Amino acid sequence: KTVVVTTILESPYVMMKKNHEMLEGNERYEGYCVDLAAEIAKHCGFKYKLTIVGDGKYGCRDADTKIWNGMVGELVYGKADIAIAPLTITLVREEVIDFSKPFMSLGISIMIKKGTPIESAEDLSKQTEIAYGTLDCGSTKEFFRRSKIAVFDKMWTYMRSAEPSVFVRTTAEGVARVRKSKGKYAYLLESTMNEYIEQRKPCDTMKVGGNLDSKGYGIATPKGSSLGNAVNLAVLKLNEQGLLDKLKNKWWYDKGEC
Amino acid sequence: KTVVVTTILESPYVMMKKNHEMLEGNERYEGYCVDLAAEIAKHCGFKYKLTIVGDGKYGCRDADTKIWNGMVGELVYGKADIAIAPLTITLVREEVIDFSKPFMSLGISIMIKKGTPIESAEDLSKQTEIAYGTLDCGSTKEFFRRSKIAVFDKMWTYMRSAEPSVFVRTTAEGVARVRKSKGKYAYLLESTMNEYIEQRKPCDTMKVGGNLDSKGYGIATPKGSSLGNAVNLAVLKLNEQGLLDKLKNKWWYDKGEC
Ligand SMILES: N[C@@H](Cn1cc(I)c(=O)[nH]c1=O)C(=O)O
Ligand SMILES: N[C@@H](Cn1cc(I)c(=O)[nH]c1=O)C(=O)O
Ligand SMILES: [Zn+2]
Ligand SMILES: [Zn+2]
Ligand SMILES: [Zn+2]
Ligand SMILES: [Zn+2]
Structure with missing residues (x-):
């Protein structure tokens, strides 16, 4: 029912609000990826829960154990349904998880x-x-x-x-x-x-x-997830409607301090 | 067995070689996408035939007839197995064909x-x-x-x-x-x-x-193609190994006339 989103505390993608301690659930956070999560859930019509990745990492594979950690690990092992973060689309990751087309180029x-x-x-x-x-x-x-x-x-x-x-x-x-x-x-x-x-x-x-x-950064889902198709189309729609550019200017320059 | 590749005559992606009348098959053409096609085929292990899109179009859908034309049409109607060209990843196209992750951002x-x-x-x-x-x-x-x-x-x-x-x-x-x-x-x-x-x-x-x-531009295949998966991995591998950056340098600036 409720989609578990894994993400990472990385400004300005995901940050605790100044008045977070008297807020609850998804309301505690703000940022580009928080806004993006809301937009994807609205267009795909699902309820969701933002959870910060336990080990605070993006994800790599242990050379000896071959176990994945970070956000990639949370998907691979079924602890999360989707990762919405500044997560880089790479060849080794594509072999174990699915990525949308990029929402950011860098x-x-x-x-x-x-x-x-x-x-x-x-x-x-x-x-x-x-x-x-x-x-x-x-x-x-x-x-x-x-x-x-x-x-x-x-x-x-x-x-x-x-x-x-x-x-x-x-x-x-x-x-x-x-x-x-x-x-x-x-x-x-x-x-x-x-x-x-x-x-x-x-x-x-x-x-x-x-x-x-x-x-590029992409939205990631477990391999074979019923969510991946819709999420990919949602990212494309959002890009085309200008929302991604809107979010970038909101979080990157409208708040510029220099 | 031989994979039919649809592409478009667009410099410097695909161009007739100066002496093309004396050459045959794939050797008639040169350019960024010619080089890229050779590399994708090598890495995925398939033989291929380059063919120029008959109507010389990228692809749009006729509002009344609803028929797709151009390179998109060749894939939709089964006339080609893959398109390797400056073909933009878009929401409406992703609804009828599959794309790799981007090989070029623009x-x-x-x-x-x-x-x-x-x-x-x-x-x-x-x-x-x-x-x-x-x-x-x-x-x-x-x-x-x-x-x-x-x-x-x-x-x-x-x-x-x-x-x-x-x-x-x-x-x-x-x-x-x-x-x-x-x-x-x-x-x-x-x-x-x-x-x-x-x-x-x-x-x-x-x-x-x-x-x-x-x-972004992506390599496109018909929906449900067995080629899709491997082509996407090939594009990621080639990006990560710097091939795409090298191909742009070769066709844009090594040959710059200004
Ligand atoms: N996006 C990366 C993580 N990541 C983030 C930043 I910001 C950086 O400077 N380098 C990285 O590898 C990934 O997905 O591994
Ligand atoms: N890449 C586009 C086609 N295309 C190409 C060029 I070069 C351009 O300036 N504008 C376009 O629409 C698509 O796939 O329709
Ligand atoms: Zn606190
Ligand atoms: Zn919206
Ligand atoms: Zn000629
Ligand atoms: Zn090679």
């Missing part, structure tokens, strides 16, 4: 503390004074681990063995590390987040260079 | 003859001296026909009723009309084509403003 990008002498991935790869890393257990890390491109493989070789670890558990941790690093840590992260942070106080970071790749 | 954009006093769709809609139109029988025309956004519906109201027709049969016709117009015609077209033309002699056009929307 790429990997570089975040620096303002004034950092870096302008590109090539710049990062050719020096050692400035540390750099990525989010753990996500598509960005896997991009570098799997890259054959000389600069990206060179970066991976450094990142894989760097001490202390250049990888972070959450996006907020990566961003804090940039801000506190005095310009000695750069962060590789998805472009739309880089762009969001750039317009938030204290306005001390910026995106440099173009995107390293191109990819 | 949006509707404005092409001007250099010097034309236009910077945005808002600019176009608020003036009358410069005419503007789109490709007929495609996703761009349908975007304007269906839009509830004030600026775009105003543009549609003008375009639908303009005489002579501001719509064109092929991309080349639209570009030619811009070039011959002395600034008095602007062309609305997909961004990646706008970008390609900007790098073609006589280097007298340019893209202005941001994109009007966001969408």
Whole structure:
């Protein structure tokens, strides 16, 4: 009956409202993905419950046990009916779960503390004074681990063995590390987040260079789910009616602080 | 056994080779989608025959007869097994054919003859001296026909009723009309084509403003095709390995004339 939605606390996709503690259920949250969830449930006509992914992760497969974690795991093992989050459509995931067509297009990008002498991935790869890393257990890390491109493989070789670890558990941790690093840590992260942070106080970071790749976020369902067809059509309808563009401007720039 | 591929003569996706009269079968053609077709077939392990869509159209549904034409029609009526072309993923098409995840991301954009006093769709809609139109029988025309956004519906109201027709049969016709117009015609077209033309002699056009929307091109198969699954995985794998980025570079910029 009630669809269980798995999602992740990631601003501005899903955030606790300022007055959350006296709110209940889905009303405790706000954001792009909260709005998107409401729109999809309205067009597909279902009731739903937003639940924050227990382990706070997007999803990766343990190399030894072969068990999936994060939001991907919640679908694979039947703990959730649908994931509505900034979840990257990838080949290894497509083999275990289903994705709608993308609701957002983006790429990997570089975040620096303002004034950092870096302008590109090539710049990062050719020096050692400035540390750099990525989010753990996500598509960005896997991009570098799997890259054959000389600069990206060179970066991976450094990142894989760097001490202390250049990888972070959450996006907020990566961003804090940039801000506190005095310009000695750069962060590789998805472009739309880089762009969001750039317009938030204290306005001390910026995106440099173009995107390293191109990819999309999709709505995910368990393989063979009776929900997947309708959800995919709903995403296309929403895009075509301009709602996705409407939501982006609402959460990204109408709230810009810089 | 041999998979019939429907595609469209649209530079630089599919072009006749200079000496095509001396060649046979698939070797008559070159371009982005020719290269992509060869790679999809290699990875999925099938033999294939490239065929040019008979009516030279992408695909629209006749309002009265309800019959699909163009490449979409070839798949709907079983004349082709797969379409590998700059074919836009849309809701109405997804209702009758299947698409892979996108192999290219793009949006509707404005092409001007250099010097034309236009910077945005808002600019176009608020003036009358410069005419503007789109490709007929495609996703761009349908975007304007269906839009509830004030600026775009105003543009549609003008375009639908303009005489002579501001719509064109092929991309080349639209570009030619811009070039011959002395600034008095602007062309609305997909961004990646706008970008390609900007790098073609006589280097007298340019893209202005941001994109009007966001969408993708996908490989299409008939509903229920056994090919669908494997083709989608192939597209994801090729994106992740950088092939699609390499093919754009090859056909757009390595060959740039400006
Ligand atoms: N979208 C990713 C997770 N994710 C998120 C951000 I924001 C990032 O900078 N890198 C990531 O891998 C996924 O689905 O694994
Ligand atoms: N891709 C479109 C066709 N198409 C192509 C170009 I190049 C354009 O500027 N506009 C279009 O509608 C579709 O599939 O209808
Ligand atoms: Zn609280
Ligand atoms: Zn709606
Ligand atoms: Zn010829
Ligand atoms: Zn190959």
